[PDB]
Design a protein around this ligand. Structure first.
Ligand SMILES: C[n+]1ccc(-c2ccccc2)cc1
Length: 517
């Protein structure tokens, strides 16, 4: 007796699976913000040093924002293309000593260089009507690193969170861990909007990061276990699609309400809504059967059977271990290759979206187009995964990503199209990685196998904001060349991974030892 055969009689894809997947995929939307929400929660608008005298001078004569932009602000191009205008104040005696409206500073200095420069004090003025983290905490001139540090904190939380949560989930089931992660993520997200000081907000963001990705992956693994062999691709890829749709909705919601506090408070409301009603999904019977807890598994199977609409026919110790993950040489090889794939995926993904994307345009529209590019990738992957196997299309997608990045490295009209194509390729590679990794490991360590293998992803996220800079100074286009090298090498290494087309996912370590047999 095997789980697959029992599943066949109940029905690989039926009413129960439809309901479960429809409820589950919404969690993907709730995780869409945590990953890439810095783009909207914290954005840097055009800003200038506060000028108390300018306030008085504005009512003296007719003033316009564009007009006042130049004759009452330090000129750009001195000791930096934009350094003076950004966060340097002339500190002239504008108030009580106004020479004239046309040339208030012409008589004081008469020369851009002659005009004195000093530290940016009295605060800052931001053009955007909608506040944000940057405006809230004045992280503009001497604290630019702070905004990147927030994202680095999220990327650091993901790491430890995965490393612990994977072990906890694989030792005490998926359902309980998923519920706890959902609750902690919701509470941290909602409390973030009430952080009075920057430090507390950063700590709350770290706490939320510790749980977000772990919960997301634990939610991804479950539907694959529920579904049968034939329909695995559909659920596995439609999950990714929800993330895409979720990403798309978030763009619109961000345009709807700009105030970052309100944005965060609202965006996590679905996270709270899930907690109440997601306690109607059962624990995966595969884990119970593998863990020698068939008693509960039979009740779960009966519950599934009654809802499905078919009649069920009448008819030693396994524990997780980190060292076991590498005990088997073949498992060692698989894990190493997959970890390298994670690392080479995260760097490309984050770096290209933050930099590769076409410059200019609104904050929202460009992100919208970035989200839109992914939908074709899901379609192409769905078309060919079963027909020509998972291995070759994934390798080809990684190769295409690397090639597109390299050709972009060396009026940018072609650059936009190449960027979109590359942007497509990288998502294809990421999805393929996420799909294959679950199906490769044995069941009783799968949750521990993937999450730990995903920990290396975090390191890439930390490296990208730093590495690029060090490379960018060394040579203008060096980061793209390195990206291409990483992409192509990863695509080549992918070919070595054993193929899985019709093989049922293994439930023992020996089975994973020799996948060919
Ligand atoms: C298209 N796309 C979907 C999901 C991811 C993802 C990133 C980090 C963790 C989990 C999923 C990346 C790309």
């Amino acid at each position: 007796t095997t789980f697959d055969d029992i599943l066949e009689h109940i029905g690989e894809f039926g009413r129960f699976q439809k309901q479960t997947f429809f409820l589950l995929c919404l969690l993907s939307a709730a995780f869409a913000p945590i990953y890439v929400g810095i783009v909207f929660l914290g954005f840097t608008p055009d800003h200038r040093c506060r000028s108390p005298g300018v306030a008085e001078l504005s009512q003296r004569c007719g003033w316009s924002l564009e007009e006042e932009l130049n004759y009452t602000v330090p000129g750009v191009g001195s000791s930096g293309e934009a350094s003076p205008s950004q966060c340097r104040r002339y500190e002239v005696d504008w108030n009580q000593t106004g020479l004239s409206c046309t040339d208030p500073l012409a008589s004081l200095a008469a020369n851009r260089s002659h005009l004195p420069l000093g530290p940016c004090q009295d605060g800052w003025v931001y053009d955007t009507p909608g506040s944000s983290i940057v405006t809230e905490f004045n992280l503009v001139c001497a604290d630019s690193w702070m905004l990147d540090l927030v994202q680095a904190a999220v990327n650091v939380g993901f790491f430890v969170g995965s490393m612990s949560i994977g072990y906890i989930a694989d030792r005490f089931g998926r359902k309980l861990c998923l519920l706890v992660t959902i609750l902690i993520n919701a509470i941290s997200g909602v409390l973030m909007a009430v952080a009075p000081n920057y430090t507390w907000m950063l700590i709350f963001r770290l706490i939320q990061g510790l749980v977000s990705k772990g919960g997301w992956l634990i939610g991804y693994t479950l539907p694959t276990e529920f579904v049968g062999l034939e329909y695995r691709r559909t659920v596995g890829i439609l999950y990714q699609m929800a993330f895409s749709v979720g990403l798309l909705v978030l763009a619109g919601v961000a345009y709807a309400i700009p105030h970052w506090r309100w944005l965060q408070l609202a965006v996590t409301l679905p996270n709270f809504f899930f907690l109440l009603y997601y306690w109607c999904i059962p624990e995966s019977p595969r884990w119970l059967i593998s863990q020698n807890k068939n008693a509960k598994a039979m009740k779960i199977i009966k519950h599934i059977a009654k809802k499905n609409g078919k009649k069920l026919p009448k008819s030693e110790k396994l524990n997780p271990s980190f060292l076991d993950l590498v005990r088997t040489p073949q498992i060692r090889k698989h894990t190493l290759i997959l970890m390298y794939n994670w690392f080479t995926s995260s760097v490309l993904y984050q770096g290209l979206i933050m930099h590769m994307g076409i410059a200019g345009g609104n904050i929202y529209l460009d992100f919208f187009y970035s989200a839109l590019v992914e939908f074709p990738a899901a379609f192409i992957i769905i078309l060919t995964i079963d027909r020509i196997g998972r291995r070759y299309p994934w390798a080809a997608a990684n190769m295409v990503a690397g090639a597109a990045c390299l050709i972009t490295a060396f009026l940018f009209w072609l650059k936009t199209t190449v960027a979109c194509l590359g942007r497509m390729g990288i998502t294809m590679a990421f999805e393929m990685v996420c799909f294959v990794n679950t199906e490769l490991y044995p069941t009783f360590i799968r949750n521990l196998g993937v999450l730990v293998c995903s920990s290396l992803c975090d390191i890439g996220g930390i490296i990208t904001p730093f590495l690029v800079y060090r490379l960018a100074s060394i040579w203008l286009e060096l980061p793209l060349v390195v990206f291409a090298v990483l992409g192509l090498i990863a695509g080549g290494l992918v070919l070595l991974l054993p193929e899985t087309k019709g093989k049922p996912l293994p439930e023992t370590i020996e089975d994973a030892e020799n996948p060919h047999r």
